[PDB]
Design a protein around this ligand. Structure first.
Ligand code: MG
Lengths: 114, 97, 266, 211
C-alpha cells in the first residue's frame, strides 16, 4: 500500500472503468424495435369493455379491439368489418386460440377495406 | 515554491472525502430497478411478438422468421441499408402464408 | 611433581638448559659467587641461594631480599604461583644440596623457562602499546562511514588527546622530579601531536559539511519527485471517478427513456 | 575491625624523608585518592587491612593515569601465534605466573615514572601498610602535579571541544532534515493508503451489482 505501487491500482481501475462501461450498454429496447419493424402497437381500448387494442400502421390506419372477458369478444374496428369476418375472427380466438393467426387475418382484412 | 503542493496530505484527504461511494452504489440500485421494470413491463408484449414467429438477433445484427415449418426460415438485416416500409412489408408478407 | 625429576636423563637435560641460560646471560660475570660456573650436579647451599636470587631479581627487580633468603623462598614461590608448590616442605629449603635436590633443581629449571617466557611476554606488551598509541588515528583516518555506522568517534578523539596529555604529564613530571622546571620539549611534542589531531578532525568537519549541503539537494529532488507522484494519483483518480459517473448518468437516462416509451399509450 | 592502635604507637617528632615526594598521612591520602575518583580508597582498607584488593586499586590507578587497559595488555601478552600450533591450552604451568609477573611489571614501570624505584611482588601480594601508604603518596603527588599541568593544556581542551562541537551541530542538522522529510513521506503514505483502501472498497461494493 505504497504510493510507488500506484501503477498497480491504475490497472484495476482501467479494468473497472472498462467493465462498468460494458455492462451499461444500451441493449434493453427489444420491444421498440419489434414495434418499429412490425408497425404494430398494443394499446388500451377506447372503451374499457374492450381492453386490448391492436394497431397496424404508423398513423392510426388500422386497429381492432378485443374484450376477451365479456360476451362481445371482437369489439370495434375502424375499417368497418362485416359480420361474417367478425365471426371468423371471434372463432380464430374463441376456438383456435392462435393469437398470431388472429393478428394476421385481422391485418389482411383491415388493410383490404379503406 | 510552486509546482510543489502547498499541503499534499490535505489534498489526498480532500480527494478521499469527495469520492462518494454510496452515491454511485445507489445509482446502480436505481439502474437494476429500471432493468427489472423494463423486463416486467416488456414480458407480455415480447411474448406476443415472439408468438408471431419473429425472433431477433441483435448479436448478428439480423432478425429471423421461423413461421416456415420444415426446417426453413428467413433473415433480415438492420444495417443502414433500405427503408423501414420495405422491412415491414417483407416481414408481414412472409408471416401468414 | 608431575615431572621425571629423579630420572637421570631428565636431570642432565634441565641441568644443561639452566647452565646455558645462566652462562649466556653472563651470570658468572655479573655475580662472581660461583664464577666460570659449570654443572653443579652437586650444589652448594650458598651457590643455590646465589642462583635463586639472580633469577628472581630477573623476574621481579626491586624485590628486597632479607639477610636470610631461605626464609623467603617459600613465600616468593607462593606469590609467583609456583604450580609444584605443594611438593615442597619448608624444612628442605635450608640445605638443598642433599637427597631432595632433584626437586629444587627442577625449581631452578622452571624459573629459567619462566624467565624465557617473561622476557618474551613483556616484549609483546611493548609492541602492543605502540600499536595502541596509533590505533585511533588509523581508524579515524579510514573512509568515513555515514553517521549511523560510525558510532563512538567522539570517544576516539577524546581518547587520542587524552593520551597526548598523558605523555606530557608523565614526561614533565619526570623533569619535575629531576629538578628541571622547563617542559618546552614535552610541550613541543604535545603541540606537534595535537596538530595531527586538529588535522584529521578538520577533515571530518569538511566531510560532514559537504554531506549536509548535498543532503539538502537530494531531499529537494525527492520531495518534488514525490509531490509529482501525489499529483499524478489525484489526477487520474479524479478522471476515473468522473468517467464512471458519466457511464452511470447516461445509463439511468437511457433506461428512463425506454421505460417512458414502454408506458406511452397514445 | 576499627583500628586506632597505630595512633597510640610512638611517633617521633623528628623526620627523615628518603623519597622525593611527600609522605601523606592516612586520612589526607584517602581524601586525595577519593577526590581522584578512586571510590575504593578508604581509610579502613588502606591500613593494616592492606589485602588482595590492592591489585584492584593499583589496576584502577594505572588504568586511569596511563589511560590503558590492563586486561588488554595481558591478552596481548599470551599470544605468539595461534592459527596453527596450539601449545597454549595445556601449559597452565606458566600462564598464571606470567600474568602475575606482567602486572607487577606494569606497576613497576609506572611507579618508576613517579619516583618509586623498587615496586615488587610484595606490594601486590604481601602488601604492608606503611609501604602501601608511601606508594599511594607518590600517586597523590603525581595527581596534584598533573592537576597543575592541566591549566597549561586548557587551550588544547577548548579547541578540541570546539571542533567536536562543530561536528555534532552539523550532524544534528543532518538528522533533523532527514527526520523531517521522513515524517512527510510518512504522512503522505498514510493518506494515500487511506485513498487506496477507499477506492478498492468502492470497486468491491460496486462489483456486487455487476456480474
Ligand atoms: Mg589537594
Amino acid at each position: 500500500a505504497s504510493i510507488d505501487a500506484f501503477s498497480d491500482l491504475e490497472r484495476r481501475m482501467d479494468g473497472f472503468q472498462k467493465d462498468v462501461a460494458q455492462v451499461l450498454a444500451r441493449q434493453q429496447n427489444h420491444v421498440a424495435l419489434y414495434e418499429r419493424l412490425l408497425q404494430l402497437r398494443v394499446l388500451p381500448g377506447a372503451s374499457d369493455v374492450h381492453d386490448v387494442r391492436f394497431v397496424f400502421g404508423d398513423d392510426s390506419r388500422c386497429w381492432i379491439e378485443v374484450a376477451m372477458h365479456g360476451d362481445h369478444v371482437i369489439g370495434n374496428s375502424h375499417p368497418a368489418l362485416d359480420p361474417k369476418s367478425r365471426a371468423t375472427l371471434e372463432h380464430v380466438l374463441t376456438v383456435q386460440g392462435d393469437l398470431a393467426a388472429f393478428l394476421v387475418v385481422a391485418r389482411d382484412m383491415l388493410l383490404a377495406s379503406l | 515554491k510552486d509546482n510543489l503542493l502547498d499541503n499534499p496530505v490535505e489534498f489526498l484527504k480532500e480527494v478521499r472525502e469527495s469520492f462518494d461511494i454510496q452515491q454511485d452504489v445507489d445509482a446502480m440500485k436505481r439502474i437494476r430497478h429500471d432493468l427489472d421494470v423494463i423486463k416486467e413491463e416488456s414480458e407480455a408484449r415480447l411474448k406476443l411478438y415472439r408468438s408471431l414467429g419473429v425472433i431477433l438477433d441483435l448479436e448478428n445484427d439480423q432478425v429471423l422468421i421461423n413461421r416456415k415449418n420444415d426446417g426453413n426460415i428467413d433473415i433480415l438485416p438492420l444495417d443502414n441499408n433500405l427503408s423501414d416500409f420495405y422491412k415491414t412489408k417483407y416481414i408481414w408478407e412472409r408471416l401468414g402464408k | 611433581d608431575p615431572r621425571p625429576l629423579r630420572d637421570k636423563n631428565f636431570q642432565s637435560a634441565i641441568q644443561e638448559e639452566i647452565y646455558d641460560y645462566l652462562k649466556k646471560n653472563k651470570f658468572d660475570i655479573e655475580t662472581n659467587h660461583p664464577i666460570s660456573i659449570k654443572f653443579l650436579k652437586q650444589p652448594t647451599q650458598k651457590g643455590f641461594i646465589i642462583i635463586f636470587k639472580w633469577l628472581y631479581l630477573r623476574l621481579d627487580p626491586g624485590y628486597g631480599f632479607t639477610k636470610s633468603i631461605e626464609n623467603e623462598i617459600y613465600q616468593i614461590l607462593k606469590n609467583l604461583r609456583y604450580p609444584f608448590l605443594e611438593s615442597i616442605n619448608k624444612s628442605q629449603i635450608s640445605a638443598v644440596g642433599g637427597s631432595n635436590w632433584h626437586k629444587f633443581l627442577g625449581m631452578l629449571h622452571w624459573m629459567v623457562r619462566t624467565n624465557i617466557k617473561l622476557d618474551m611476554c613483556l616484549n609483546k606488551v611493548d609492541r602492543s602499546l605502540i600499536n595502541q598509541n596509533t590505533q585511533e588515528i588509523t581508524i579515524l583516518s579510514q573512509p568515513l562511514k555515514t553517521l549511523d555506522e560510525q558510532d563512538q568517534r567522539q570517544e576516539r578523539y577524546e581518547l587520542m588527546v587524552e593520551k597526548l596529555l598523558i605523555d606530557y604529564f608523565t614526561e614533565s613530571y619526570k623533569s619535575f622530579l629531576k629538578l628541571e622546571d622547563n617542559y618546552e620539549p614535552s610541550m613541543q611534542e604535545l603541540k606537534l601531536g595535537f596538530e595531527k589531531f586538529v588535522h584529521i578532525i578538520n577533515t571530518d568537519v569538511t566531510s560532514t559539511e559537504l554531506k549536509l549541503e548535498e543532503l539538502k539537494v537530494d531531499l529537494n529532488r525527492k520531495r518534488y519527485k514525490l509531490h509529482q507522484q501525489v499529483i499524478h494519483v489525484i489526477d487520474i483518480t479524479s478522471k476515473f471517478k468522473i468517467n464512471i459517473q458519466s457511464s452511470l448518468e447516461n445509463s439511468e437516462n437511457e433506461l428512463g427513456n425506454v421505460i417512458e416509451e414502454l408506458r406511452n399509450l397514445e | 575491625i576499627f583500628k586506632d592502635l597505630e595512633a597510640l604507637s610512638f611517633q617521633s617528632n623528628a623526620s627523615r624523608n628518603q623519597d622525593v615526594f611527600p609522605i601523606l598521612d592516612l586520612q589526607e591520602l584517602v581524601i586525595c585518592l577519593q577526590s581522584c575518583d578512586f571510590a575504593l580508597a578508604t581509610q579502613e582498607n588502606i591500613s593494616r587491612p592492606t589485602s588482595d584488593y590492592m591489585v584492584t586499586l593499583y589496576k584502577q590507578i594505572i588504568e586511569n593515569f596511563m589511560g590503558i587497559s590492563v586486561e588488554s595488555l595481558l591478552n596481548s601478552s599470551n599470544q605468539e601465534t595461534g592459527d596453527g600450533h596450539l601449545q597454549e591450552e595445556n601449559e597452565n604451568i606458566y600462564l598464571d605466573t606470567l600474568n602475575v609477573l606482567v602486572l607487577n611489571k606494569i606497576c613497576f614501570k609506572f611507579f618508576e615514572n613517579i619516583g618509586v624505584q623498587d615496586f615488587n611482588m610484595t606490594d601486590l601480594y604481601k602488601p604492608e601498610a606503611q609501604r602501601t601508604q608511601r606508594l599511594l603518596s607518590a600517586v597523590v603527588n603525581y595527581a596534584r602535579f598533573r592537576e597543575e599541568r592541566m591549566f597549561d593544556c586548557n587551550s588544547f581542551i577548548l579547541q578540541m571541544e570546539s571542533l567536536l562541537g562543530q561536528i555534532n551541530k552539523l550532524n544534528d542538522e543532518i538528522k533533523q532534515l532527514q527526520k523531517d522529510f521522513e515524517v512527510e513521506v510518512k504522512e503522505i503514505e498514510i493518506e494515500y493508503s487511506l485513498l487506496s483502501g477507499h477506492i478498492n472498497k468502492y470497486m468491491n461494493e460496486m462489483l456486487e451489482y455487476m456480474q
